[PDB]
Amino acid sequence: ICEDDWNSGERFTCTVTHTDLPSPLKQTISRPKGLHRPDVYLLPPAREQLNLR
Amino acid sequence: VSEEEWNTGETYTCVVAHEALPNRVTERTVDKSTGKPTLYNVSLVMSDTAGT
Numbered sequence: 524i525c526e527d528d529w530n531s532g533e534r535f536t537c538t539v540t541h542t543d544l545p546s547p548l549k550q551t552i553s554r555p556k557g558l559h560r561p562d563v564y565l566l567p568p569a570r571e572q573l574n575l576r
Numbered sequence: 577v578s579e580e581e582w583n584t585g586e587t588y589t590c591v592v593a594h595e596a597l598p599n600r601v602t603e604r605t606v607d608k609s610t611g612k613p614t615l616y617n618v619s620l621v622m623s624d625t626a627g628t
């Protein structure tokens with residue numbers, strides 16, 4: 524499916540009809556809303572790591 | 577001492593015994609590179625300045 528349809532959050536259903544049980548199985552999958560910007564820190568290795576070698 | 581002995585000088589020691597010494601014996605050592613040396617040949621290396 525296209526991306527903006529998933530970002531919009533429309534409900535999607537899968538129809539499961541297996542042989543022994545004629546009753547279909549229905550489920551709902553949607554993307555919840557709620558956005559904080561991550562802060563990335565890249566820690567250098569400790570000087571003891573440079574000591575061990 | 578002979579001059580060739582001072583060249584590539586060996587350790588010459590002055591050992592004196594007296595009542596007033598702490599261990600009753602003291603020692604002083606001189607050679608070419610200690611007593612009034614012409615040059616101070618030293619090699620100074622530092623490694624792992626970062627430390628731990």
Ligand SMILES: *[C@@H]1O[C@H](CO)[C@@H](O)[C@H](O)[C@H]1NC(C)=O
Nearest residue numbers: 584609615616617618619620
């Ligand atoms: C002076 O020191 C350097 C480096 O340690 C050494 O290569 C050289 O042989 C030394 N010379 C004398 C006369 O001790």
